[PDB]
Design a protein around this ligand. Structure first.
Ligand SMILES: C[NH+](C)c1cc(NC(=O)CNC(C)(C)C)c(O)c2c1C[C@H]1C[C@H]3[C@H]([NH+](C)C)C(O)=C(C(N)=O)C(=O)[C@@]3(O)C(O)=C1C2=O
Ligand SMILES: [Mg+2]
Ligand SMILES: [Mg+2]
Ligand SMILES: [Mg+2]
Ligand SMILES: [Mg+2]
Ligand SMILES: [Mg+2]
Ligand SMILES: [Mg+2]
Ligand SMILES: [Mg+2]
Ligand SMILES: [Mg+2]
Ligand SMILES: [Mg+2]
Ligand SMILES: [Mg+2]
Ligand SMILES: [Mg+2]
Ligand SMILES: [Mg+2]
Ligand SMILES: [Mg+2]
Ligand SMILES: [Mg+2]
Ligand SMILES: [Mg+2]
Ligand SMILES: [Mg+2]
Ligand SMILES: [Mg+2]
Ligand SMILES: [Mg+2]
Ligand SMILES: [Mg+2]
Ligand SMILES: [Mg+2]
Ligand SMILES: [Mg+2]
Ligand SMILES: [Mg+2]
Ligand SMILES: [Mg+2]
Ligand SMILES: [Mg+2]
Ligand SMILES: [Mg+2]
Ligand SMILES: [Mg+2]
Ligand SMILES: [Mg+2]
Ligand SMILES: [Mg+2]
Ligand SMILES: [Mg+2]
Ligand SMILES: [Mg+2]
Ligand SMILES: [Mg+2]
Ligand SMILES: [Mg+2]
Ligand SMILES: [Mg+2]
Ligand SMILES: [Mg+2]
Ligand SMILES: [Mg+2]
Ligand SMILES: [Mg+2]
Ligand SMILES: [Mg+2]
Ligand SMILES: [Mg+2]
Ligand SMILES: [Mg+2]
Ligand SMILES: [Mg+2]
Ligand SMILES: [Mg+2]
Ligand SMILES: [Mg+2]
Ligand SMILES: [Mg+2]
Ligand SMILES: [Mg+2]
Lengths: 50, 111
RNA sequence: ACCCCUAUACCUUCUGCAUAAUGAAUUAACUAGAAAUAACUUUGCAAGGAGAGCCAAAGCUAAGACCCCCGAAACCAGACGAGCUACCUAAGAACAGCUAAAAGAGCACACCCGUCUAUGUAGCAAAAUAGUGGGAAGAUUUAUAGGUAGAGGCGACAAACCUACCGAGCCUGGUGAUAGCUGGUUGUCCAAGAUAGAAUCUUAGUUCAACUUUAAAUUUGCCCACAGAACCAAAUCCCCUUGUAAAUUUAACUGUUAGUCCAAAGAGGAACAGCUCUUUGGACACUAGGAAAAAACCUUGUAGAGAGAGUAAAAAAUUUAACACCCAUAGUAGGCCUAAAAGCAGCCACCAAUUAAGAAAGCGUUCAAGCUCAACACCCACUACCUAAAAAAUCCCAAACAUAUA
RNA sequence: GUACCCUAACCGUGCAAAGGUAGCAUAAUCACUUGUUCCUUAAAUAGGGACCUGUAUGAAUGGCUCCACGAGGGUUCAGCUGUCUCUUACUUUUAACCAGUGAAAUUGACCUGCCCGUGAAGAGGCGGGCAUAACACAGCAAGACGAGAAGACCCUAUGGAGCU
RNA sequence: ACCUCGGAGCAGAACCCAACCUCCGAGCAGUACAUGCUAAGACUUCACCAGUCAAAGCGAACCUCAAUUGAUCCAAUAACUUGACCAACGGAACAAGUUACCCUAGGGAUAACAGCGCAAUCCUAUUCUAGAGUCCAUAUCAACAAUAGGGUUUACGACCUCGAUGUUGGAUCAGGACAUCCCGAUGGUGCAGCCGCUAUUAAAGGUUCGUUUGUUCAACGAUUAAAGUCCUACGUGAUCUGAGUUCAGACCGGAGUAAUCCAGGUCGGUUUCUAUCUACUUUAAAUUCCUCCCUGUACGAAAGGACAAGAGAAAUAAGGCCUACUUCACAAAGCGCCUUCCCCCGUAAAUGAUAUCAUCUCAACUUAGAUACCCACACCCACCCAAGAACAGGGUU
């Protein structure tokens, strides 16, 4: 999202161009377990959103 | 970790025990249900766990009928009296069509 | 005879072994399924049968036919052991020479021990040899007898030593201890035969179910037509026909209940794993052909002989980047801002002369100045395929071949 | 909390039976750790001296010095030397050949090759290629997951035992 | 951490369906007092036990809730009835630690090393062009992100092996990859020269000695042309070592009532093998540094300061020999002496079409661009040897 926003905001002409998202903000949560953890022991904590 | 506990209960084995057209004797349980999915109709009684059993001996038929609750059933009457005009509720009902007559008159004496 | 072609010993264990997992040199001999309750079969007699006792609403009597071998560490009882060693008792013995002459003193033999090294490791030796060392008149060393014994002794505690495996000696007995664990389990031939699950000091086991096997009795069993199964996708349930021949019940038991990949729907993990967990379905643990070798992918199953035939599955194809030429004065250093910002720092407008040039699309200048594009003319004509990598460790890996009618 | 950092002679508060005293101190000492500084060496995670709530030192769980002593552990001057740079020569034993006597562990069967691939995942034996008359003697130790000891670690067992 | 019971998802539509999977709860409360008796037919948590609904009838009247729970024996009671956080919840009536002093039966059904799978982590290359670099993306570095590759780390998995696959560093011997540390060739530069930085090609040859530490590493000293990165069962213990690490002894600090323990420190501590099979046991072209001159030349304002060509001197490596030296002595050796010879491909240019210019050309085309050793062969009884384990070989005029 930052790549899209920065590239389009830099390259666009704000006097004759306009841009909108057709994709919502990151909402689906992705969880990661601790580094080096063995298999099992519950589901990992929420890391980020996509 | 895994701080979720419980949720180990088995399946209740509920649902339909007698489908369409099945010959059913008196007192046979037709359906077992946790909520009112199928309603009792003609010659079908309901037991306090909301089970459905046959009151007569015959053939099980599932129909779809209009729903008029008892005027003392407060929440159902509230839903009725908040429904818009021109609309009617429909529910699935279970009936037993009795196959045999109640009895016969036959000759026993020649007095 | 070899040379050609085919061909990954056996047993056990396992999801799966050519496995570089187990066992086996070989020969001969020895070496491992014992029985009840019932059931079934065949007789005898029969509302009774049996040579007392017992059973009997067709039973009773008799026979047949069914249940292995080896192995612990252990525990207890009674003996035998202190000729080794631990400590003790009785009475003995040895300790050269030198320092100083007193010493649990020093050097140093005999003697006692065993620090370090090397050799040895089925040895000379079930702890040795060689050198090097600690002590060597003392808490020393040692010969002889005797004592203390295992629920114990003895110990300058190393949980050491008690007749060469002492965290509890050895022998005999109980004893053919026990082993949900490993190993093994011996003629021939045929047939049926593959894994829902629940409990459990249970997950290396067992019991019940499920599946499987046999023998009986009976009538429906699989495939399924329409109608039908709830509010908050693939399908399934139910099911008459029809295609078929199996199903249920009764009797009697074992064994399997430590599971692998592939396709699909998901869950956990990294939208990792030849990962783990469920579900549907295949195949494998059974044969054969193919994908190189090959478990699980594809083809195909019911058995034999043939020097016959038709087939199934079955052999990877691809090779990519040329792009113009010629030209350019000028209203103006458009206005504002700034030291200047001149088409090109930032703003407003974007008109307008020449035939034809944006109040300038890139560069370039502190700013300037400069050079390219868009524009005239010029002319054959914009010629326009719209695409894109490379690495590892013994030695590349069939040989090869674009062109003779499917 | 209090004297620029640090640190509190000091003040306040709470608990305990008492709140670690003297001494020593980076230790034969949890982590920090190769603590900081000086000596020693050309060069020091070593050794010695010093500082140090040692945030887990410490007083017969004995604390700290000290004389002798130690096959105890560590450092070092000087010398010595095949320890090494860097190995060489000789003798004896061993060795190898002739003669006599004559074991053991091991051993499914073997007519017992190399490369790459495959596969119960590390092939002499399977696939594709390569190599290839037969047979002794000496040597080597890369492989035969070489031999030995039903793994000395780990787990399991409604298996044991010793100790508290 | 959990162990029993229930609801929702996973499991969308008959039933069922797991995970140390994702969430929510339960171990009651309230009413009644016919919450009496009895009895067809059914359901069923995949077994059993347990659990669930109920027509009719007698007698009266005219239960809510989702789980809300515990078997048998036995105990209390005259009887009816009532007894566990038996929560390890199908429950043994009542039993903890520790073991490195340990033992047994097994397990690669299960961990540690090694192999394998995977690549999260680690490493590399490209793509994009923000940004840094006075200006300038692309001399050099590089954000967000994308694509692809490697199998050196730490994991993760539990597939071979527990009727043994012995282990960290070191010695010895090294085989291989190139992602090159040096030497070679080339392109770019913010390359004047010397030095550099970056990229392409190149694996023939090379890649030091020491102090501390058991160390791999790391720091430091002194050099060198350089002191490469890896893989090879973290190559290599039937070739060696045993400092470390994880047996039995002991100490310190801490923990524990104690036995004992510490993924803490410290001192000590047995490394067996006679080779059966495979494999192998003599394959002659060497690299590098330094000195001189070129030359104080090119270049540069100066300071600084080359590349070619050529000459010499070494060092190592390979092969060999004893004249002298030295260990020594009919000889074997080094510390001594002698000899050692080809290229190597990145690219830079000329002519010239497709495309009548140009263009180094996956256009046709032009240029930069080995020899040596060995080689004959029943004299052989025997002797000698500079030949040799035996055998073989050479000499015996
Ligand atoms: C080889 N040594 C260092 C050793 C090591 C271990 N531990 C290991 O296996 C550790 N190895 C690792 C590092 C984990 C790979 C060990 O476990 C052992 C031993 C030694 C043996 C000695 C045994 C001895 N016998 C069998 C030769 C013996 O007679 C006695 C005795 N004193 O009587 C023993 O103590 C002995 O049986 C023994 O205990 C040993 C080990 O257990
Ligand atoms: Mg559930
Ligand atoms: Mg369940
Ligand atoms: Mg296995
Ligand atoms: Mg096979
Ligand atoms: Mg083999
Ligand atoms: Mg084995
Ligand atoms: Mg085998
Ligand atoms: Mg085994
Ligand atoms: Mg017992
Ligand atoms: Mg005696
Ligand atoms: Mg004395
Ligand atoms: Mg003395
Ligand atoms: Mg002791
Ligand atoms: Mg002890
Ligand atoms: Mg037995
Ligand atoms: Mg059959
Ligand atoms: Mg259990
Ligand atoms: Mg078991
Ligand atoms: Mg699997
Ligand atoms: Mg002494
Ligand atoms: Mg002999
Ligand atoms: Mg292989
Ligand atoms: Mg040999
Ligand atoms: Mg074993
Ligand atoms: Mg058990
Ligand atoms: Mg049931
Ligand atoms: Mg009634
Ligand atoms: Mg339990
Ligand atoms: Mg239970
Ligand atoms: Mg100990
Ligand atoms: Mg054992
Ligand atoms: Mg591993
Ligand atoms: Mg910039
Ligand atoms: Mg598994
Ligand atoms: Mg093993
Ligand atoms: Mg074996
Ligand atoms: Mg072995
Ligand atoms: Mg390269
Ligand atoms: Mg290794
Ligand atoms: Mg070896
Ligand atoms: Mg031991
Ligand atoms: Mg010692
Ligand atoms: Mg050895
Ligand atoms: Mg062999």
């Amino acid at each position: 999202f930052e790549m899209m926003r920065l590239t389009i905001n830099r390259s666009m002409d704000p006097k004759n161009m306009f841009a909108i998202w057709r994709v919502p903000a990151p909402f689906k949560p992705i969880t990661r377990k601790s580094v080096g953890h063995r298999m099992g022991g519950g589901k990992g904590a929420i890391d980020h959103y996509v | 970790s895994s701080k979720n506990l419980g949720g180990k209960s088995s399946g209740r084995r509920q649902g339909i025990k007698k489908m369409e057209g099945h010959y059913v004797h008196a007192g046979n349980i037709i359906a077992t249900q946790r909520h009112f999915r199928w309603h009792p109709g003609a010659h079908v009684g309901v037991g306090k766990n909301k089970c459905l059993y046959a009151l007569e001996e015959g053939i099980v038929r599932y129909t779809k009928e209009v729903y008029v609750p008892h005027p003392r059933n407060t929440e159902a009457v509230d839903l009725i009296t908040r429904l818009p005009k021109g609309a009617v509720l429909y529910k699935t009902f279970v009936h037993v069509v009795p196959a045999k007559p109640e009895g016969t008159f036959k000759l026993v004496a020649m007095l």
